[PDB]
């Protein structure tokens, strides 16, 4: 199936499957059962920022999530992406809701990837920045319920006409061009992703969360991955 | 058919269709018959650099082609791209040979596009830089005889095993992701493209040329566009 | 004395000295009497954006000023900066008030300059971006009444504790490092500057304006340059 | 005195003071006796590249030094720069020779710094790239024997008219503008430095080395810091 490396911003604790008993951010390597998690003081209705970084020298995937004037949550995990992902991948954002729901609104998203060749010592680079999403954003592959243009935002999961989030929704947005994430002959390689989001929920328990992911080029939403599986995994193994 | 805006580095003068009687660089707007040209002292076997710029404030497309320690050739043309191209396009490089030939080798290629919206005054941007091309360059759509990986270069037209260029060849390389080149609510929109090339020819008259182009997203090589047509136009009109 | 090239956002019409009879943007080359102006529909109390561009190929200094969802004002003037400015300069923002006043608040400021060698075809570049100004911004040279840190903004002219603008004020802010704006052996040189401002006035006629400027490295506020002189010129000649 | 954090490319082993018995790269925190070192297969007369990265999330300073088609040497050290350096600093390059010598030629140098505020979540950034050094490089503070312009290169240490390196030389080059390396209210802060060098020596043992360093703004070369002190420290403690 698909190979997924993801940083999840999990708003709903699903303890039956390994989740700690509070909202949290985690690093998922081919499984929804986070290799490492951190407590996340999610604020309903506020705009927050997630920053994801990695480099081939340190081989550490790190993420910082925060809201203005509040403490940030950080999670890091040592992982050599060379052994996990194919050299060419697609990057994207995914979100879901189940019995409980929330808006999974993306207000901005940027990504920078750099590869320095050992033979050449010159760099190949890719950078994209979205601060506005149009109703016909052709450089984005929208999967599931994901839509763009509403107020210039990216809505990963279904929201009704009047602005209310729907349950049992799943959606993803992948950047159109494949990304060369690693290469055997590379001296240094690194990527950095940033996105601002707005998670808002009418009910007591918001669910299920947002995730920045890296996958094989032809990745598709596994059937039935609504809710706990965050639109990324086919099962809870 | 296709909508094409291109900057050509024409090495072969086809006077029957409007070419000046010497190698030159030109700005082509929907026709191979350049709106503006400038004399170009092409140097057989030397590595050159081409720099193309445009901004929606001035509405002027400019290109500078030069070799290290030599005079540069410059050509500019006032054109409002909103009236010629669709708002979403693909960018690429094209080349061809005919009775006469030449290698149409690309050693590097970079492009940067920016769009500042009117509703938000926030910018969307795209940037890619290739200084090395691998044998499996998944973020390039290769058309015709174009290939990559040979010495880390991009060969737009057919070259034999021993390095000799072939005639009646046409090839193009387009960046995988569509580019939002303009929008009605844009305060400013600009792009910049740079590429280094190596044109080498065994015969007295090198042909036919290399071109940086912008087209509709689904653009493909028009049949019989070898030689003078540079793999861009269906006829000489 | 000083050599000044500037783009003014002139809010007060001083018809005695050439100003047209309405708010306007203009290009000033060594004199407060602009070489070219354009009507500017200034909006009291709204945040606007100014974008200034120039390149050595077209040798045209262009500027666009606009407010979200409003028409933009544009002004362009052909000028070869090599003949006017020394090769090493400082870039900054200046503002003033006189009998009438306004806040001359700068919310963000970025600048990018690139010089490309003819010998090498390689680039030297400088880029800075301020989206926040701290109380002790060591990379900015503040002159006159300019201060930083208040709400993380840069106040070019005097503003009272309660937020009310004072008359007869003048202040500037220059980036600390000299900038290599042009070079004889350069193939292509270009610069781009962007700043967001907030001009708010309690009285009927706001005055006097804000200006982006380029000057010799050791430039200082000319004595008596409040009001119509915008902290840039010693007289109205 | 001064506060120095440096990455040294030490070519001469001074075993009395801690150096391992071979050329190496190391991370120095307020002392010439490196906290961590790694064997470095220095190649006399070849052009190499040094890449230094740091981010405040991982709080790890890493450096990779290599030559095209050769293995790289890597060294990392966990250090929270907030506890050692002031929030504003100057960045530079230093080099020295003693009884033995070498050319300490810098061919290129780039640096990028970014600081994201907690209060706002907006980034302040600084970027400079030098691929050519001119005879009057006004944005560099040259100290000691350092000079620029020769072939467009930066010579940190004294080289005679005929290209031969001198002994007992020391020199540094610092970027003119102070750099905001950290802040209490920062969500993320990171920097990346890259430079290409050419170490060539006529004698059997090249000495003494090159260092990328970060210091207090008003740092100057300590007197007598030739040889093993690399133009950075007053003594060997
Ligand atoms: C009723 O208890 C069980 O089911 C609960 C509901 O589970 C759905 O909703 C979740 C939150 O949106 C989602 O994560 C899950 O996949 C289901 O779609 C659940 O809260 C309990 O933990 C339990 O499994
Ligand atoms: C026989 O003369 C005519 O054809 C000549 C050859 O034309 C081919 O080769 C050209 C150069 O490679 C190319 O531009 C053209 O499209 C054909 O592929 C031509 O050189 C003469 O000018 C004339 O048209
Ligand atoms: C008395 O009329 C003359 O002076 C008036 C006041 O001029 C001051 O205020 C102006 C607006 O702040 C400023 O531009 C000028 O330099 C003086 O500080 C002026 O309004 C009239 O136009 C006239 O010059
Ligand atoms: C007498 O042997 C000792 O000193 C030698 C000379 O030391 C000078 O030169 C060194 C190499 O350039 C330099 O590192 C040092 O600071 C002095 O300037 C040295 O070569 C021997 O290894 C030994 O320490
Ligand atoms: Ca969960
Ligand atoms: Ca032709
Ligand atoms: Ca005026
Ligand atoms: Ca040593
Ligand atoms: Cl000593
Ligand atoms: Mn989880
Ligand atoms: Mn032509
Ligand atoms: Mn005026
Ligand atoms: Mn050492």
Chains C and A touch, contact meaning at least 3 pairs of CB atoms under 8 angstroms apart: no
- In the structure encoding, which two tokens stand for residue D23, read together? 């050329």
The approach used to solve this structure was X-ray
Nearest to B187 among C49, C60, C188 (CB): C49
Resolution (A): 2.0
Let me know: does A111 contact A97? Beta carbons within 8 Å: no
Task: State the Cα–Cα distance between residues B39 and A23, nearest whole angstrom.
Answer: 66
What residue has token string 């929201």? A159
Backbone angles phi, psi at A229, to 5 degrees: -80, 0
C74–B62 CB contact, under 8 Å: no
Phi-psi region of A151 (alpha: psi -120 to 50; beta: other; left: phi over 0): left
**Sequence-distant (≥ 6) Cβ neighbours of residue D227 within 8 angstroms:** D96, D97, D98, D99, D168, D207, D208
User: Of A219, A199, A207, A200, nearest to A168 (Cα)?
Assistant: A207
The fold for domain A1-237 equals Jelly Rolls (2.60.120)
Nearest to A187 among D72, D187, D190 (CB): D72
Task: State the Cα–Cα distance between residues A125 and A113, nearest whole angstrom.
Answer: 6
Let me know: does B185 contact B123? Beta carbons within 8 Å: no
**Cα pseudo-dihedral C195, C200, C201, C205, rounded to 10:** 50
Let me know: does A125 contact B130? Beta carbons within 8 Å: no
User: Of B18, B70, B61, B62, nearest to B42 (Cα)?
Assistant: B70
User: Of D108, D94, D3, D99, nearest to D50 (Cα)?
Assistant: D108
Tell me how many helices (H) and strands (E) chain B has.
0, 16
Task: State the Cα–Cα distance between residues D210 and D196, nearest whole angstrom.
Answer: 11
Residue A139 in contact with partner chain B when CB distance is under 8 A? yes
Q: Is D176 annotated as a binding residue?
A: no
Let me know: does A226 contact A94? Beta carbons within 8 Å: no
Pocket test for ligand 1, best of A13, A14, A17, A229 (most atoms within 8 A of CB): A14
**Sequence-distant (≥ 6) Cβ neighbours of residue B29 within 8 angstroms:** B5, B35, B77, B79, B84
- In the structure encoding, which two tokens stand for residue D18, read together? 């801690």
Q: What share of chain A is helix, strand, coil (3-state, %, to 5)?
A: 5, 45, 50
A7 three-state secondary structure: strand
Kind and range of the H or E element at B161? Answer: none
Q: Which residue of C has its CA nearest to B190?
A: C53
Contacts of C49 in chain B (CB under 8 A): 116, 121, 187
User: Of B63, A209, D70, B173, nearest to C57 (Cα)?
Assistant: B63
Residue D124 in contact with partner chain C when CB distance is under 8 A? yes
Task: State the Cα–Cα distance between residues C73 and C119, nearest whole angstrom.
Answer: 39
- In the structure encoding, which two tokens stand for residue C171, read together? 């202040």
C207: Cβ below 6 Å to ligand 3?
A: yes
Q: CB C232: neighbour CB atoms within 10 A?
A: 27
User: Of A123, A117, A26, nearest to A79 (Cα)?
Assistant: A26
- In the structure encoding, which two tokens stand for residue C234, read together? 């010693």
Let me know: does B191 contact B54? Beta carbons within 8 Å: yes
The β-bridge relationship of strands B147-148 and A123-130 is: unpaired
Contacts of D50 in chain A (CB under 8 A): none
B71 three-state secondary structure: coil
Residue A151 in contact with partner chain B when CB distance is under 8 A? no
Task: State the Cα–Cα distance between residues C145 and C156, nearest whole angstrom.
Answer: 7
What residue has token string 């390059």? D93
Task: State the Cα–Cα distance between residues B53 and D187, nearest whole angstrom.
Answer: 36
Q: How far apart are the first and last CA of chain B?
A: 13
Q: Which residues of C102-137 are buried (b: 16+ CB within 10 A; e: fewer)?
A: bbbbbbbbbbebbbbbbeebbbbbbbbbbbbbbeeb
C129–D120 CB contact, under 8 Å: no
B127–A123 CB contact, under 8 Å: no
Task: State the Cα–Cα distance between residues A233 and A208, nearest whole angstrom.
Answer: 13
Question: Number of residue pairs across A and B with CB atoms under 8 Å?
Answer: 81
Let me know: does B230 contact B14? Beta carbons within 8 Å: no
Task: State the Cα–Cα distance between residues C22 and C18, nearest whole angstrom.
Answer: 11
């Amino acid at each position: 199936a698909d190979t997924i490396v993801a940083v999840e911003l999990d708003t709903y604790p699903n303890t039956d499957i390994g989740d700690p008993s509070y909202p949290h951010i985690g690093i998922d390597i081919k499984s929804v059962r986070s290799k490492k998690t951190a407590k996340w003081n999610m604020q309903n209705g506020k705009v927050g920022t997630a920053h994801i970084i990695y480099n081939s020298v340190d081989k550490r995937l790190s993420a910082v999530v925060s809201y203005p004037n509040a403490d940030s949550a950080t999670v890091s995990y040592d992982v050599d992406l060379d052994n996990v992902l194919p050299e060419w991948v697609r990057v994207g954002l995914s979100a879901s809701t189940g019995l409980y729901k929330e808006t999974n609104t993306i207000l901005s998203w940027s990504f920078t990837s750099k590869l320095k060749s050992n033979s050449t010592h010159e760099t190949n680079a890719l950078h994209f920045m979205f601060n506005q999403f149009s109703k016909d954003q052709k450089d984005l592959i929208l999967q599931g319920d994901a839509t763009t243009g509403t107020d210039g935002n990216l809505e990963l999961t279904r929201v009704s006409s009047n602005g209310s989030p729907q349950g049992s929704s799943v959606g993803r947005a992948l950047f159109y061009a494949p990304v060369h994430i690693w290469e055997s002959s590379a001296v240094v390689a690194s990527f950095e992703a940033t996105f601002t989001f707005l998670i808002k929920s009418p009910d007591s328990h918001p669910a299920d969360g947002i995730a920045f992911f890296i996958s094989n080029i032809d990745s598709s939403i596994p059937s039935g991955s609504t809710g706990r599986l965050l639109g990324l995994f086919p099962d809870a193994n």
